[PDB]
Design a protein around this ligand. Structure first.
Ligand SMILES: C[C@H]1O[C@H](O[C@H]2[C@H](O)[C@@H](O)[C@@H](O[C@H]3[C@H](O)[C@@H](O)[C@@H](O)O[C@@H]3CO)O[C@@H]2CO)[C@H](O)[C@@H](O)[C@@H]1N[C@H]1C=C(CO)[C@@H](O)[C@H](O)[C@H]1O
Length: 370
């Protein structure tokens, strides 16, 4: 059972959890209520397990794509911001957290992947994916590579798979059609084939993950990476002079990152729903609260208009929004789970050579539309 008279918060380990705990400390100073911030391994998989028995945190942070599944399962409370509070955030961010007519979380930040480049290694970043192999060939002479990014999580490869026509679920007749999936169309295959060709030509390695890519970029070993705003503060601390820019085009079309809205949901089993609302509305979603988290690990563009206005001038934030505008906001529908897990398997199998691109994506399409 969840303890009454305290708040327990779960947030992903790549986010500014120490900054969030500082907001928790302010809450405690004011109200005497203890806030415990945790970053469990695989929290987004553990949550539906424990919440189903009336357990888990009072508040869970994730991108909104997970939240439709949680709400469908009865695991999230309807949030009750008044009109004046809703007016403080951008309308589209509330749309991301609306499920079957109900608001089921508070939006916090708007995340998109960008191309991150070392200004000293590549003063003029490549406008196209197609030119990157030639760039790699020149950099290899100096024992450097053109690009490294996480090939284990489909989030990072999706912008290239989507570029030429890949999609998750078609929005038709005012809703996502769960039987109209675009993972094995010609566009999707063209994008994944390009990635695989990069691997075959030794521009990248199939085993590259978040840690490997991050270490290589931040140590000046690779010229470019693909990452989101949470990554910037580690690069700030590194010796690398980096820029954040538009993702490269593929076949003349923009890369299309899936846009996530970092959101805070209240456990339907929480005996602390009022405290959660007070914390989220009156502590976190303030200039001071967001600043605390943002100083720890950057949130990106934020949902809170007053604070976003202060961030807007930063070229990294401009680049984030430019990439977001080329991409699409993720569905929050339950079937996003089927989609992501199936795509994950497809990318890993194709990259490793266990399957061809065509066979991997066809199997993903069959799995998702079951
Ligand atoms: C396979 C994976 O799918 C789902 O994960 C997706 C997230 O739900 C999306 O929000 C997005 O995550 C990115 C965040 O939005 C962003 O803020 C940053 O944290 O980077 C994230 C990407 O690393 O994209 C994800 C897809 O890449 C689903 O929620 C998640 O549970 C699934 N991952 C699990 C699956 C396996 C395989 O059995 C395990 O290896 C993993 O440890 C699990 O986490």
């Amino acid at each position: 059972k969840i303890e009454e008279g305290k708040l327990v918060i779960w947030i992903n380990g790549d986010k500014g959890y120490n900054g969030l705990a500082e907001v928790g400390k302010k809450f405690e100073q004011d109200t005497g209520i203890k806030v415990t911030v945790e970053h469990p391994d695989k929290l987004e998989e553990k949550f539906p397990q424990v919440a189903a028995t009336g357990d888990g945190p009072d508040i869970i942070f994730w991108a909104h794509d997970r939240f439709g599944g949680y709400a469908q399962s009865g695991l999230l409370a309807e949030v009750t911001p008044d009109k004046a509070f809703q007016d403080k955030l951008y309308p589209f961010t509330w749309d991301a957290v609306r499920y079957n007519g109900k608001l089921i979380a508070y939006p916090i930040a708007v995340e998109a992947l960008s191309l991150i480049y070392n200004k000293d290694l590549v003063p003029n970043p490549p406008k196209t994916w197609e030119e990157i192999p030639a760039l790699d060939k020149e950099l290899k002479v100096k024992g450097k590579s053109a690009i490294m990014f996480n090939l284990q999580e489909p989030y990072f490869t999706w912008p290239l798979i989507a570029a030429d026509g890949g999609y998750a679920f078609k929005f038709e007749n005012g809703k996502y059609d769960v039987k109209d999936v675009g993972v094995d169309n010609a566009g999707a295959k063209a994008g994944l084939t390009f990635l695989i060709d990069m691997i075959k030509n030794k521009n990248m390695s199939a085993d590259t993950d978040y840690s490997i890519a991050e270490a290589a970029f931040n140590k000046g070993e690779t010229a470019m990476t693909i990452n989101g705003p949470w990554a910037w503060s580690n690069i700030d601390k590194s010796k690398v002079n980096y820029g954040v820019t538009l993702l490269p085009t593929f076949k003349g079309k923009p890369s299309k990152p899936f846009v996530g809205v970092l959101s805070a949901g209240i456990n339907a089993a929480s005996p602390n729903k009022e405290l959660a609302k007070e914390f989220l509305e009156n502590y976190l979603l303030t200039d001071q609260g967001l600043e605390a988290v943002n100083k720890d690990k950057p949130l990106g563009a934020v949902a809170l208009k007053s604070f976003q206005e202060q961030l807007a001038k930063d070229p990294r934030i401009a680049a984030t929004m430019d990439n977001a505008q080329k991409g699409e906001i993720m569905p929050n529908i339950p079937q996003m789970s089927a989609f992501w897990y199936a795509v994950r398997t497809a990318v890993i199998n194709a990259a490793s050579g266990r399957q061809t691109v065509d066979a991997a994506l066809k199997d993903a399409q069959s799995r998702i539309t079951k």
